[PDB]
Amino acid sequence: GPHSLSYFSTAVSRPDRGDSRFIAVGYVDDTQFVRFDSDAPNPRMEPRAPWIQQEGQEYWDRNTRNVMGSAQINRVNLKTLRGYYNQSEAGSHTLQWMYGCYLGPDGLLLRGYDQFAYDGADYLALNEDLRSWTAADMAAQISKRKWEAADAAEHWRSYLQGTCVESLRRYLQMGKDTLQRAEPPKTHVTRHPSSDLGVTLRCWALGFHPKEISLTWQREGQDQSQDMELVETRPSGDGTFQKWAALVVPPGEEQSYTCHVQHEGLQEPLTLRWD
């Protein structure tokens, strides 16, 4: 698994108030570490993980200035896009922006990205060459031509290849005891009534980190993915995660079924059954 540093920003227009709101969050891997909210009084970039608090005032001042300027540009972007699409001035719209870097095994950039969505749909994205952009429609073509004229890709390529991965490496060191710790899942299978003709087996994985995990059910060697309910992986609230996978099986046939768990905290894939 490549580590990553990622910033996720949401800009929302608020015509009834005459303004906009911009929220940004930063993550290393699955761990949030900073936030910014333009509705906050005196708004600043703020810490959200303990290990970032060792950064000095220059870091917080620079982060604040950078995210504040970005909030101002995105406030204007909401108006610009409303005009490109000839939308009413009364409606709220959403512009999301996400950029970040994944770290290769050699300490270089494995992949960088910088993209936007408007009202949930892809708008404009930096291609993996970091030299060119892909636009989703005629509006985004206007933006793309602007950004080709300005050589906006150079600003992003330089960041992604340089400071993004160097920052990431620093944060991985700062937070090594949590960020670089894999915690394996605690696992068990529960049994619940379903009907006359069925019982539910639920395979649980609790307390694991990172969030990536595989839970599958088999019956005597055959995978059951088509008939199982697999919930979205969910946060515990303490930096770990939870997941379950459930299947309705015939009454009395529980021993034919095995749950299979893969996670980077386990030494070997686990097989378990209801007991």
Binding site: Y7, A24, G26, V34, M45, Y59, R62, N63, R65, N66, V67, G69, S70, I73, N74, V76, N77, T80, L81, W97, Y99, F116, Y123, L124, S143, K146, W147, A150, A152, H155, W156, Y159, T163, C164, S167
Partner: peptide, 9 residues
């Protein structure tokens, strides 16, 4: 370390 946007859409 947050990179500022430099350009508008």
């Amino acid at each position: 370390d947050f990179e500022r946007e430099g350009y508008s859409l």
